[PDB]
Structures are given as C-alpha cells and as structure tokens.
Design a binder for this molecule. Structure first.
Ligand SMILES: Nc1ncnc2c1ncn2[C@@H]1O[C@H](COP(=O)(O)OP(=O)(O)O)[C@@H](O)[C@H]1O
Ligand SMILES: Nc1ncnc2c1ncn2[C@@H]1O[C@H](COP(=O)(O)OP(=O)(O)O)[C@@H](O)[C@H]1O
Ligand SMILES: Nc1ncnc2c1ncn2[C@@H]1O[C@H](COP(=O)(O)OP(=O)(O)O)[C@@H](O)[C@H]1O
Ligand SMILES: [Mg+2]
Ligand SMILES: [Mg+2]
Ligand SMILES: [Mg+2]
Lengths: 520, 527, 550
C-alpha cells in the first residue's frame, strides 16, 4: 500500500455528477419550505430536543450531512442569515438548481468548467443591473409602508394570523435600537420568552426583564423613580490574589480579623450610600451581611447578573458600569427609570424596569412573547428575527425590489434576450442561468396546486408587455402584479440570493477528484 | 406511501463488482502486460536464462520459451491473458518466437504510454499500428531470397535452419549430435502430410542426452507382460508384425450372456466350447506366420500361453496414438477379425531387438527403409531436462516442418527488426501528421528484440544500436549482432537462417494483441 | 507493477522488515512517484481542476495549491516524503512553481528509471542532467526581458494575473490585480542600508462571507481582528492624529512573585495591602490616560477593573491579539512596542513618543464579525484585504490564492528581469538541449536528450486538462521554437517567433506579451535545482531497508 489514499477513487465526469446529485438533494428537502403555503419540517437532534420550522436555515443546520460537496450547501445557510437573515431557503433552492440547470453539460457537450464560470461571472453582473432597474425606492419614514414590508417574511410563517400585531412589535424594536448611518445590531435585542399566555397580550417593553426576585422582604418592589447603579465587584469579602496568612500572637487579634470583615464590607456600603441608589445590581454574588447596611439606606440588592445583561441595563437607564466602589460618582448613576415592579408567575419571578422614554447612546429594549408552549415560543422568535431583519435592509438600502418571484423571473427574461445576441461559445452557459432563475417562481405554483406549464407561459408573456411587477400569487395561484398585491421585499435580500448562489456554484464546478478519510 | 422505515438506494451493478473507466483503466491494463513481460525479457536470446516455476500441486516444470511459462501460472487479470493467447497461437501455428511475440506486443503498449498521457485518444493510436503492420509484412517478403536460385542441396537447407532454434536451450553445446536427429525425423514423414503426433517423444528417466538414438521404427514400450513373457525371444530377424483391434480374453469385457443347460451331458460341451472358440482365433494367427502380435485391448493368458511355444511375441494394452503410429511403418493396417487376416496386411523389418534402459524395456523396430514415421528416445540426469529437451526438439522440428512447405530465407538475431524499422522511418517523414510519431514509435518498438540480445550478453545496448543505425544507413541486409565474435556483422555469412513464418506472425500477433487492449477503456469484473 | 513479491532468503537475515534490492526498488520509487504526481497533474494550469480531501471529522479542504494537497497527504513510502517536502520547500522560498516542480521531478524519475534499464550508469545519467542544467540556466539568462516603455503598474498587474489563474480568483483576477500590487507597495520598507525588502504575510487577510468577491474592499491601512473589551466604548474615533498605544502589559489583578510569602501580625494591615494590589496597576494606567491616548492596544487580557477608567476617559480598550500583528501597527503609526514599561531612571514614567499617529481608528462590522480598521497611518503606510465569498471553505482557498499572488509580485520587484510563461520556457529549453550534447555525444548524449524531453511534461499536461488536442499544440511549439534557434542577430524576423505559444483558453498560438501572462525569473531558477536534488537522491538508491518499529 501507499500513504493514506485510494480505496475507490472517483475520477472523470462521475465525480462532478456526484457533486451535482448530492447538492441537488439538499434543495429537494426544503423544496416544500418555499412559499406562503409551505409546510413544516420536524427535526430530531441527538440531544433529545425538537426543532420544527419551515426556515431552511434551521433545517439544514441541525441535519448532519456527510458528503464533501453536499456540506458546502449547508454552509450557504449561515451566509444569508449572518449577513441579512432573510432568504435562507431561497438561496439553497436557487444554488441547488443553478448547479443542475447551468451544468447538465460535460455529461453531453463536454464543456470545460472554467468556460462556464466565465459566463457565470458575466451573468452575475447583468443580473444585478436588472434588479436595480426593477427596484422602486420607498420612503423609510412612512410607518404604513414599513408595516407592509415586514409582513413579506411573515406571509410564509405561522404568525401571519398575528401579522397585524407582529408588525407593531418588529417596527418598534428596530426603531429603538437604531442609532443616528442608522446602524443597528441584534445583540442588544433580547430574545427572552415567557411560557404560556396570549399572543395578543405580548408587547415590546423598554428595559431589561430580570428573572430574579428581590433579595430581602423589606426591599421595595414598587419604586416611582428607580436609580440603578451597576457594580461588577462582589459585595462579599475579597480574599485577594495572595494569601494573607495572619500570624496571631495574642487572642485579641483573631477577633479583630472577623471584626474588620464586617467593617470592611460596611466601608464599601457607606460609599454606595453617597449616591443613595434605589436599586443596586451586582454582577457577582452578594453576602447577607452587605444587604443590611444597604437596606438601611434604601438600596436594593439583587442576585448575581450575567455580563450580557449588564450591558443592556446601562443603555436603558444611561448608567455607567462602575467596578470600583470608591470611584463611584453621581454622574455614573442611572436615572429616568419609569417603573420597577415584580409580577408573580409560577415558573419564576420577573422584575420589570421601565424607561421614561425622554441624541446619545442607542436605547435597549426587550421583547416579551406569550405563546402556547415552549416550542411555539422558539418558532415565533425565529420569525421575529426574520421579520426584524427586513427593516434593517430598507434603512441602509432604501431601494425596494419586487417580490413574489418577480425578481427572479425578471432576470430570466433579460438573460434570454441577451443569450441570442451574445452568441459565441458562452451562449449555452449564459442561457442556462435563466432556466435556473425561473425555478423559484415555479416552486410557488407547485406548492399552491396549480399548473406550472400554463401559468409560467403567461407570466413570461405578460412580463414584457404588462410591467416588471407581474408575479405569481401565493394563495390563489393566479397572475397578479406586485403593485396591487401590496407586498414587497428589499433589494439586499435579492442581491444576496443571486451572488451567494452563483459564487458557490463556481466552487463545485472546479472539483476534479474526491478522496475521503485522508487523515486528521 | 412507502412500505416502512427508510429505503436504501439500489446500486446499479451487483454488490462486489469492480468497474472503473477512463484513462486510468488503460494504464492499469498496460502495466499488467508489462509486468508479465518483465519475466520474459531475460529469456530472449541464445544467452537467455530459464525460469523455475512451481505450481500449487508442487509439480516442478522448467521451460525457457514463453508459451509454457504462461501455461504454468494461472492468469487472472484480463489484459494479461492476451499475452497468453498470442503465445499459444504462436506455439500451435509455428512454435518459434513465442517469447519474442510477447516482447513485441508488450513493447507496443509501452511506447503508447506517453501518447495516452497526451490528449491523443487510443483510437488514433491504433490507426498508426494498423497502417505500419501492413507495410512491415511487405518488407519481409522483399527480403526473402529463394533457395533454389543457387541450386543448393535440400538436406543442408534444413540443417542450418534447425541449429537456429537450438539456441537458448541446453542443446546449444550438444547441437552437433542433436540436429542430425530432428533433420532426419522430418524427412521420414511425407512432404504432403506432416504430423506432430508421429514425432512424439517418450520420457525415459535417467541416462545421458548424447546417448540418444534415432531409428525410423517406433517403440510401443510395454504394459503388463502376462504369463509366458521373457521366454519369447526378444531379438528377431525378419518378423511379421500383426495388429489386432479385437480383444483376446475368456469372457472378460463381453456382456453377460445367460446360459441355461437342462442336461448334464450338454454341460460338458459348453465348457470345452469356450476352449475351442479362443483357440480358433489363436490358430488363425499362426497360419498367417505373424511373429509379432500387437493389440490395443488386453491380451488373455491363454493367448500368451499359445504364442509361448511358437516364440511369437505378443504385447497388448497399447495406446491408440501409438498403434496409429505403428500402422504407417508396417505397411498394411489393423484387421480386427482373425479369419479375415490376409498376408498383405502383415508387416516386416530388417532387424528387431528389445533392450532395457532406465530399468524399462522397449521394443524397437529397426531396419525400415519405407517407414514414414520416426521415434525419439531422450535421456538425462534430471527429469526436468528431458521435458526441456523434448520441448526444445518439438519447436526445432517445427522449423524444418514449416520450411518444406515454403522455403524463404529471413534474417535473424535482430537483423530483420532493424532493417524493417529504418524503412518505416523514411516512410514516416512524408506523413506529416499524428501518424508520424506513431510510426516512429512503432519502428522504435521493434528494436526491443536486439535490446535483450546485448543486455543478456553483458555488452552495452547503447553502443550497439549506434553502430547499427550508422551501418544501416547504407544499403544492408542480414546485418545483425553476433555473440561468438563479440562484434556485430553480417548474419548471412554466419549461415544462421530463420523461416519467414516466424517474423510474419510475430508482427501480426503483436499488433493484434496491442490494438485489443488499447480499444478497452473500461473493465468490469463481477462476483 | 510489482508482482509475486520477493522470496525471503534464510541465508540473509536482518532484524525488522525484509530487505528488497535490485530493480524492484526503482520500480517502487517511480510507482510511489506517479502516485503523488497524478494528483497534481489535473490541478495544473488555468484549465486545471483542484481536488477535495476529507479530514474524517466531516470537514474538508478545497485548494488548488499543490503544497497544501501534498502536506495533507502523509506518505509512508520513504522516497515519497521527498516530493512532499519538496512542495513545502517550494512555496516557502520562491512561493510559486509548486505544482510544476512536483511534475518536473516526477518525469525526471520516470525517464531516468527507463535509462537505468538501458544499462547506462545512474551517475552518468546524473552527470547528463547536471551538465544540461548548467547550460539551461545560461539560456534562461539570454531570454530575460527587462521591463521598458511600460505605462504605470501594468508590468506588475499583468504578472500578478498569472498566479491568480488556475485558482478560484482567476475569474475575478481583473479586479484583484490592483489590490495585490498596491498591497506590497504600501508595506515597502528599507533595510541592508538601501536595499528594498518586503514583509511576508504583513497584509492582513480577514474572512467575512457575504455579498460578492468582486466587492471586496481594499483598506488603505492595516486591519486587526479583535473584539472590543467593553461594549460601552466608542466604536468610531472622530478627528485626526489619533494616538495608538501598543502595550505588552496586561491590566489585571495580579499575584505577587511566588517567592514571596506575606505574614502579618496585625489585622489592621489587611486593608492597605489588599488595596495596594490593585493600586500598583493604577499607577501605570493613570499616566497613559493623562497622555491623551485614544486607542490602547494590549497583548494580554484586561480585567474589568481597569476597563472602568477607559469608559470615563472615552478610551477604547483592546484584549489579546497576535504578537506579530501588534508589531506592524506600532511601526506604521510611529509607536514603539513596549514589552515591559520602564525608564533609564529608577522612577516610572511615560513618554509621548511611545504613542502612534494615524488619521482615524474605526471598528466596522462585517457580517456578524467585528474588526478594527486603521486608515491613514503616519510613519509608514500599510494595507489589508478582506476576502468575501459564498462559504468559509471558499475563503480558505482565496487565502492561499492571495498568499501565492503576494509571493510572485514580491520576487518581481527584486529582479527586474522576467520570462514569458505558459509553457514557453519549457518548450524553449527542449530545442536548446536538442542541439546540445550533439558535440560531446558518446554515452552522455542519451541521458541529456531525455532531460530535454522531460521538460515537455509541463506543456503537454496543460493541454490535457483543457479537453483539447495536445498533439496539435505541441507540434506547433516545436515548429516555431526549433527553426529560430540558429538566427543571426541582424535582418530581424526570426527570433520574433519562439517567444510565445500554448494559450489554453483559445487553443491558438498567440503572443504572451500582448496577452499579459508572465512569470518572474526567480520562479524558474531553483525550481530545476530543487527538482534535480529530489531526482538525484531517489535515483542513487539501489536498496531500501525497512526496520520494524519497537
Ligand atoms: N405570499 C407570497 N406569494 C408569492 N410569493 C411569495 C409570498 N411570500 C414570499 N414569496 C416569495 O418567496 C421567497 C422567499 O420568501 P420567504 O419564504 O419569506 O423567505 P424564506 O424562503 O427564506 O423563508 C421570496 O423571494 C418571495 O418572492
Ligand atoms: N545463433 C544466433 N545468433 C544470433 N541470434 C540468434 C541466434 N539464435 C537465435 N537468435 C535470436 O534469439 C532470439 C530468441 O531465440 P530462441 O530463444 O532460441 O527461440 P525463440 O525465438 O522462440 O525464443 C531469436 O529472435 C533469434 O533472432
Ligand atoms: N493565464 C495563463 N495563460 C497561460 N499560461 C498560464 C496562465 N496562468 C498560468 N500559466 C502557466 O501555468 C504554469 C503554472 O501556473 P500555476 O498553476 O498558477 O502555478 P503552480 O504550478 O505553482 O500552481 C506557469 O508556469 C504559467 O506559465
Ligand atoms: Mg422569508
Ligand atoms: Mg526458439
Ligand atoms: Mg501558481
């Protein structure tokens, strides 16, 4: 034998055929996950949980696929999520069809892959210009226009029944995090969920929701104007980096050691009382001795807090995190807190911090959600992340692309017209791109139960004469225009679908041979 | 809709079937033929070395030629079986050059290795070999000189051609005595009908090779020698040879015949009746005066008892291949009816003697000038030497066998391959195409036979080929390598000659074997 | 090609594995050579295709570089490790010709092994290769072309596109050409008293998958990959002359030296000793904040104790980063890297000369990753390239695709003489060595003639991966080059040929000067020298001896 190698080496055209067949099977599973009528997929993890969603991102993430080429399709799910967050299912279906539709050849024509890649680069450039021409800008300051825009990703989800309520939650969450360009991030958006309740009763509340009850019974659970001060240091007695190792010669020295530990913690409590904070939040644990001198002055003690929640509390009340108690000043004390209350729920306690709402640092807010179970909460949370991500594209990119499969079909018509004018050896790879673009609107017909032969034939004819906004209706499976359909989608979602799908197809076409299990 | 659980995919071919396609399959098929060629490279040439092969049955067999070597080992890979077919086809048709055909067939695949690594597909490569093999055969016929133009003797013609096949064997030193045998063996056979079964050599363990003898008669050895043997004289003057296909026995191989006798007196008649039926066939043999009785079927005891008093020698259980060899030299032919035997069916000879060699007794027919058959009794120390000399003389008789049909003088020892290769290079210069590199590779592939001649001799093959191409520049023929004088020169003055059927079949078999594997780009093996 | 194995002789005994001698070793050396050679044959040339290797954990690697492919292949054959380490030596020194040197050295072993069976001695074969190589190097010096009458950077732009070919960036090589040329010119420094040298890897490669590869932005300055310590710190610094502090000193609660044991007889000393432990660190950070440093870089992690003063002073804190990354930041901005803070005097102090200078320091978020973009450096310019792709596996290939392009341009500005690529040199060295050795002749003529045809494996392999006719292109490369070797340097015409050929895209013979494909002369030299030593070492081995492990 030689090295680590051989076994059965797949060479020739069958190595690329195995790459096309395996990657095509990735889009066939979520093929029914596209459209407003899309079904759901229940996943079984090795940990014992359950994941039920129609989003191709969460479906392809938990599924373990062992194959050199097929795993590259799994990586495309996080490309759409991390950059945008909407259109993850469209990219996988498009990229899966491009590899099959743009390269049936080399099984027949024996065309070299790089020759096809050179046509894919020119087809991607022309596809971007077509999307820019069919995109009509929309005002970002219109609240009525943003509500119908968020409902785009909602129409394919289960929250479409609450869409009227859901657009209220997604618009106020993005506008609050937006800081004046207008850069926002979801790290400050809280995904915390409340089990049980009514979805209509769920609302976005400013502030941070804590799961911890007040430590002492005499701590006031109702405060008109709370004053919050954040402390990273624990209120307990610090042992120090090096051992103290006190040598006690006389019996009176040992009692002084335990007496200072009471006075040393008391010294840190007296410095806190200088700013008389109503609510004191400590990142680490707190001793039962430190809470007494804080209760005498009116300070409130809480359980240890994670580092992630300390950053959101400082944004709401404007407080500054103060580690050193001696350096604590009135300038770093948080103010303008609306209400402090604690409500009883059987699972856990909940502490509410309300903002007085009245440029500076961006405000933080939490989204309360009342579902029917624990798994329903995780489904709506994934729906909110997809719905709120739509509002981030329109603010950075006011351009608005056509939806309902009109973007992909508009490109397929322009590619077919330039395919005959280009001629050359690249006409076949260039024209084959248009055949892969019409598969996305074709899926909308197969899920609706209509005839894709007669509908797509009239869709291409009415596209040139009628307008560029003509598309497939999801519910009725008919030919309608996106102007009267009332739903649109940002251009960033369509641009990421065309770029990621084509750039990934060029990687799989360059594969010659495949060797498995070389070494680790 | 599904039956249950999950359904695995169905593989097209049966599980365990090895199938691979592309250029990598042809390279694996060529390396299978080259690996087999590596064993037959040192065997080429008069200085070639024998190969010792032991099979799974622990049966020792030593053979210099590549025909038997490939028969001993069991070949698995399909492409390696192609070299076995050309070795057996060369052996049955002619029998000489069975090793050189494998060397040429594998060298054509070796020269096609750099062509397959290029963008040239194997279909255009076969076109150059098919075109070059047609011109190479026409060159051999033009280099053949008729022997009747010089009006030489026909006996000396077969002697010089027989000594060529004796090379590379154990006969090369003893060829003085051994060539004078096989040459006289083919002259006994009819020029119109030549048979390899009549020249069959018996294996006699022990003895010396130079102690062998050649007599126009035959030897049927012996089987049992029933009661009455060793009393009969083993030396006859002018015996009458009689052969019988009928079996002489008392109710032995005859089918069971139920005999019912209702009387006691009639039972005495049937007992003496069998004695009269057996002695009736024996009495009719004596009336003809036959001193030698041969039979294919066993001989009964009463028979040998009858001929014991009459001195007539009788030996049965002789094989059919031996009896068919006897009936030719004895004149008239077997009569299986004792009452139908006529005087003209009996044989004769000038002398008959039975002598014992190697603890085995052999009846030797001697003094038969009209005998159209012959026998060869070979000896030796090892039993493997006898099998080697028998196969050495077998291929040597085939030289003088094919020479009587067609008489053509063709050069040997690398002289023919170098002359044909240069004529192909001058023709390739006018092609100006893909075939120019293929014909030049085909002419270079024909040089492999002179390669193993110098390599096995210890001399360098680079300096010899350089002296050839400079010498072949001017018009020359028969010019080749000479091992005795250590210098390369004219083989026509060396008198070494070879038949034309060896070189013509070597070029046609090597091209046919090469184009067969190169046309297969995929191999599928089930089970 | 080895059958029947070998018969173990009882008269010859050695501990460990059996000893194989004769032609079987050289047959296994070529068999092991063709095993690693056939892997890089399909990956050579713009029409070539790379291969995939599974790591058994589910992760794979897609790269066209022959060095990474051979590095991932662990060869148990003793002579097979030479070609594996040959690729790691090729990209480390020159940085180009990695796939070619493996294929050239493979054909040298295949032809020489066929010559050993011809009975010519290997040392005579080696002598023929070394004499032919000495004259081949002299021919490379004759075909050198110095850049003249060129407009702008087009000389370096056309050469950089050659290395970009055969890789995923080849289609985008038009846009990436200006990014690579401008990257190595910004890191330009001076050493050896006037000699110009360039750092390797100095250009930061950041991986963010999104948008398209053609939209990759070229930052006019260095970019560092790190996460901010405190989220309350400003991510954008407004105003010019931003002061950057490069420090190797972490700010943390630290234990006193292990050779110290604190023993106190009074409880009253526990308050001052515990407070002084954090107070010693305060003296170092206080003098830095008072100097007006906007950005403070630190090699080691910083506890939240000292991150409080950075928020009040509006100073951006930094945590653990690569040590080699912080060196080029201080050199570009003018700062001085401080391993340990000290002064010549026995008193601690901080000088303003240790602070860097730049136009601005901003933190941009690419996808979900956040990195710092430092633009407009003062003392020395810098550059960075953020690669964008569909998935992280394509970004892993673009890194090696970008790293190989930096090595080709690096060797271009060191020697102004360049040679045309695309199989032009391999076709020119063939005919030059054909007329060679004709004067000497004798036995060495055969070994030298095979060395000339051994270089033909490179131009012939390029035509196979293009699914075209190789015999049509190879016959043309021999037609234009052969007739022009005897030309006399007047009446012109003549040598105007032979300088171009073997265009894989159009399958026609076109001028490489107008096409733009060029290769540095450094990549051609030392490639045949390293391939010769790999051929000589393997050819000289008659017998391989394997010892069983204990
Ligand atoms: N109600 C609808 N009718 C027709 N097409 C729709 C409808 N909703 C969404 N689509 C199309 O489906 C595509 C994907 O939308 P969506 O399902 O919200 O995202 P994802 O496929 O990532 O879940 C969009 O490009 C859009 O054109
Ligand atoms: N006396 C000789 N001088 C030169 N060459 C010879 C001589 N005898 C045989 N040869 C060459 O040696 C080769 C091998 O011959 P041999 O081994 O005897 O039979 P085969 O050809 O069947 O293997 C032949 O091709 C022939 O050309
Ligand atoms: N665009 C091109 N056109 C013609 N020849 C090229 C082109 N790009 C590279 N080559 C040739 O291919 C050879 C190998 O290039 P490449 O594969 O990029 O480097 P390596 O062999 O080190 O991987 C070079 O010698 C060069 O002459
Ligand atoms: Mg959506
Ligand atoms: Mg013979
Ligand atoms: Mg390169």
């Amino acid at each position: 034998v030689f090295m680590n190698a051989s076994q059965e080496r797949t060479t020739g055209r069958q190595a690329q055929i195995s790459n096309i067949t395996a990657a095509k099977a990735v889009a066939d599973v979520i093929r029914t996950c596209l459209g407003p009528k899309a079904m759901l997929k229940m996943l079984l993890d090795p940990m014992g949980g359950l994941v039920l969603t129609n989003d191709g991102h969460a479906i392809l993430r938990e599924i373990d696929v062992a194959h050199p080429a097929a795993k590259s399709m799994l990586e495309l799910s996080r490309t759409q999520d991390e950059e945008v967050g909407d259109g993850t299912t469209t990219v996988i279906i498009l990229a899966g069809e491009i590899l099959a539709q743009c390269a049936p050849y080399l099984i027949e024509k024996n065309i070299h892959p790089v020759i096809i890649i050179q046509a894919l680069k020119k087809a991607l450039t022309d596809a971007l210009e077509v999307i820019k021409q069919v995109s009509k800008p929309v005002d970002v300051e219109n609240d009525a226009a943003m509500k119908k825009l968020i409902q785009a990703s909602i129409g394919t989800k289960y929250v479409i029944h609450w869409s009227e309520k859901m657009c209220e939650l997604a618009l106020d969450a993005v506008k609050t995090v937006r800081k004046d360009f207008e850069i926002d991030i979801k790290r400050y958006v809280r995904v915390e969920k409340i089990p049980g309740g009514d979805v209509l009763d769920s609302r976005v509340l400013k502030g941070v929701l804590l799961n911890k009850d007040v430590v002492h019974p005499k701590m006031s659970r109702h405060i008109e104007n709370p004053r919050v001060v954040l402390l990273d240091c624990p209120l307990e007695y610090k042992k120090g980096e090096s051992q103290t190792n006190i040598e006690i010669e006389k019996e009176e020295d040992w009692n002084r050691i335990l007496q200072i530990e009471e006075e040393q913690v008391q010294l840190m409590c007296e410095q806190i009382l200088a700013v008389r904070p109503t609510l004191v939040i400590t990142e680490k644990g707190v001793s039962d001795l430190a809470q007494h001198y804080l209760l005498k002055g009116g300070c409130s003690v809480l359980r240890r807090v994670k580092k992630s929640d300390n950053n959101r509390i400082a944004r709401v009340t404007g407080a500054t995190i103060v580690n050193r108690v001696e350096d604590l000043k009135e300038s770093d004390v948080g103010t303008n807190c609306g209400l402090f209350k604690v409500e009883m729920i059987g699972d856990e306690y909940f502490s509410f911090l309300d903002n007085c709402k009245e440029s500076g640092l961006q405000k933080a807010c939490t989204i309360m959600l009342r579902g029917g179970s624990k798994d329903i909460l995780n489904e709506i949370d994934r729906n909110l992340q997809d719905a709120m991500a739509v509002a981030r594209n329109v603010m950075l990119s006011p351009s608005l692309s056509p939806g309902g499969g009109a973007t992909e079909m508009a490109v397929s018509v322009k590619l077919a017209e330039k395919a005959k004018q280009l001629e050359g050896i690249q006409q076949w790879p260039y024209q084959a791109v248009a055949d892969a673009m019409e598969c996305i609107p074709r899926t909308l017909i197969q899920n609706a139960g209509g005839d894709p032969i007669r509908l797509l034939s009239q869709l291409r004819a009415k596209h040139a004469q009628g307008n560029f906004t003509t598309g497939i209706d999801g519910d009725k499976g008919k030919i309608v225009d996106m102007v009267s359909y009332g739903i649109w989608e940002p251009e960033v979602i369509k641009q990421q679908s065309v770029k990621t799908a084509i750039e990934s197809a060029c990687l799989l076409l360059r594969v010659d041979d495949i060797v498995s299990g070389v070494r680790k | 809709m599904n039956f249950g659980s999950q359904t695995p995919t169905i593989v097209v071919l049966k599980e365990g079937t090895d199938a691979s396609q592309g250029k990598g399959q042809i390279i694996s098929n060529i390396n299978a033929c080259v690996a087999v060629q590596e064993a037959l490279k040192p065997t080429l040439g008069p200085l070639g070395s024998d190969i010792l092969i032991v099979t799974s049955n622990q049966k020792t067999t030593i053979s210099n030629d590549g025909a038997t070597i490939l028969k001993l080992l069991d070949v698995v890979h399909p492409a390696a079986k192609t070299l076995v077919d050309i070795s057996r086809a060369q052996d049955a048709e002619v029998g000489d050059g069975t090793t050189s055909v494998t060397i040429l067939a594998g060298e054509l695949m070796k020269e096609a290795k750099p062509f397959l690594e290029e963008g040239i597909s194997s279909h255009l490569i076969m076109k150059g070999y098919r075109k070059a093999v047609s011109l190479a055969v026409e060159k051999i016929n033009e280099l053949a000189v008729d022997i009747t133009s010089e009006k030489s003797s026909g006996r000396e013609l077969l002697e010089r051609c027989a000594r060529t096949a004796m090379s590379s064997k154990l006969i090369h030193n003893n060829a003085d005595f051994f060539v004078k045998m096989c040459v006289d063996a083919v002259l006994s056979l009819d020029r119109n009908d030549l048979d390899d079964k009549l020249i069959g050599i018996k294996k006699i363990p022990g003895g010396a090779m130079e102690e062998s003898l050649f007599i126009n008669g035959v030897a049927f050895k012996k089987t049992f020698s029933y009661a009455g043997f060793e009393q009969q004289p083993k030396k006859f003057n002018n015996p009458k040879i009689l052969s019988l296909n009928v079996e002489l026995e008392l109710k032995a191989e005859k089918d069971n015949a139920e005999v019912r006798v209702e009387h006691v007196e009639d039972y005495q008649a049937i007992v003496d009746a069998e004695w009269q039926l057996i002695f009736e066939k024996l009495r009719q043999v004596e009336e003809t005066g036959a001193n030698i009785v041969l039979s294919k079927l066993p001989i009964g005891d009463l028979a040998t008892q009858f001929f014991a008093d009459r001195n007539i020698f009788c030996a049965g259980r002789v094989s059919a291949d031996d009896m068919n060899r006897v009936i030719q030299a004895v004149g008239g032919s077997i009569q299986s009816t004792t009452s139908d035997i006529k005087p003209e069916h009996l044989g004769t000879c000038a002398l008959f003697e039975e002598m014992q060699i190697g603890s085995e007794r052999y009846n030797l027919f001697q003094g038969c000038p009209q005998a159209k058959t012959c026998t060869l009794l070979l000896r030796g120390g090892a039993e493997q030497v006898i099998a080697e000399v028998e196969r050495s003389l077998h291929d040597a008789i085939m030289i003088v066998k094919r020479a009587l049909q067609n008489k053509l003088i063709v050069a040997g020892g690398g002289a023919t391959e170098m002359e044909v290769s240069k004529c192909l290079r001058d023709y390739s210069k006018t092609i100006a195409g893909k075939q120019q590199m293929i014909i030049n590779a085909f002419a270079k592939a024909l040089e492999v036979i002179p390669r193993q001649l110098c390599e096995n001799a210890g001399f360098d093959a680079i300096e010899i080929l350089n002296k050839l191409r400079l010498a072949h520049s001017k018009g020359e023929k028969w010019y080749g390598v000479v091992f005795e004088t250590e210098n390369i020169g004219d083989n026509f003055a060396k008198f070494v000659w070879e038949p034309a059927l060896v070189k013509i079949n070597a070029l046609n078999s090597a091209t046919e074997a090469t184009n067969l594997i190169l046309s297969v780009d995929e191999t599928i093996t089930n089970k | 090609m080895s059958q029947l194995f070998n018969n173990s002789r009882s008269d010859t005994l050695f501990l460990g594995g059996e000893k194989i001698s004769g032609d079987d070793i050289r047959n296994q050396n070529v068999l092991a050579t063709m095993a690693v050679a056939n892997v890089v044959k399909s990956s050579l040339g713009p029409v070539g295709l790379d291969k995939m290797l599974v790591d058994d954990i589910g992760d794979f690697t897609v790269t066209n570089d022959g060095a990474t492919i051979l590095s991932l292949l662990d060869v148990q054959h003793p002579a097979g490790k030479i070609l594996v380490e040959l690729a790691q030596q090729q990209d480390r020194e020159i940085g180009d010709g990695t796939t070619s040197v493996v294929i050239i050295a493979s054909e040298l072993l295949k032809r020489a092994n066929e010559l050993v069976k011809n009975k010519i001695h290997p040392t005579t074969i080696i002598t023929g290769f070394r004499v032919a190589l000495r004259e081949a190097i002299r021919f490379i010096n004759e075909v050198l072309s110095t850049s003249v009458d060129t407009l702008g950077k087009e000389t370096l732009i056309n050469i950089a596109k050659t290395s970009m070919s055969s890789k995923i960036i080849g289609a985008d090589s038009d846009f990436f050409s200006n990014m690579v040329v401008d990257a190595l010119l910004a890191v330009k420094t001076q050493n050896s008293k006037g000699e110009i040298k360039y750092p390797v890897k100095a250009v930061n490669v950041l991986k963010a998958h999104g948008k398209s590869a053609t939209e990759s932005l070229l930052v006019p300055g260095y970019a560092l990959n790190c996460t901010v310590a405190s989220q309350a710190m400003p991510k954008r610094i407004a105003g010019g002359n931003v002061k950057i502090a490069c420090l190797d000193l972490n700010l943390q609660k630290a234990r006193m030296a292990m050779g110290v044991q604190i023993n106190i007889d009074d409880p009253e000393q526990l308050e001052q000793i515990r407070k002084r432990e954090a107070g010693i660190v305060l003296e170092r950070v206080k003098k830095i904040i008072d100097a007006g440093a906007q950005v403070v870089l630190t090699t080691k992690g910083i506890d939240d104790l000292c991150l409080k003063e950075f928020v009040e002073a509006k100073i951006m804190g930094v945590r653990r980063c690569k040590k080699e990354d912080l060196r080029r930041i201080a050199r570009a901005t003018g700062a001085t890297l401080v391993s340990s803070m000290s002064n010549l005097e026995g008193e601690e102090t901080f000088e303003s000369s240790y602070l860097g200078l730049c136009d601005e320091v901003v933190q941009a978020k690419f996808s979900d990753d956040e990195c710092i973009l430092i633009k407009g450096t003062s003392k020395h310019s810098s550059s960075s390239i953020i690669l964008r792709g569909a998935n992280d596996y394509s970004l892993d290939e673009m890194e090696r695709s970008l790293h190989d392009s930096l090595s080709v341009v690096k060797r271009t500005l060191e020697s102004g003489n360049v040679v045309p690529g695309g199989g032009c040199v391999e076709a020119a060295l063939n005919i030059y060595l054909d007329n060679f050795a004709t004067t000497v002749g004798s036995r060495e003529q055969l070994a030298i003639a095979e060395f000339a045809a051994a270089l033909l494996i490179i131009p012939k392999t390029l035509a196979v991966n293009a699914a075209k006719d190789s015999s049509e292109l190879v016959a043309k490369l021999r037609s234009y080059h052969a007739a022009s070797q005897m030309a006399k340097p007047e009446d012109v015409k003549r040598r105007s040929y032979r300088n171009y050929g073997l265009d894989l895209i159009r399958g026609k013979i076109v001028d490489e000067i107008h096409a733009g494909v060029l290769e540095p002369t450094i990549s051609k030299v030392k490639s045949l020298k390293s391939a010769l030593e790999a051929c000589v070492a393997i050819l000289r081995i008659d017998t391989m001896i394997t010892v069983d492990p204990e």
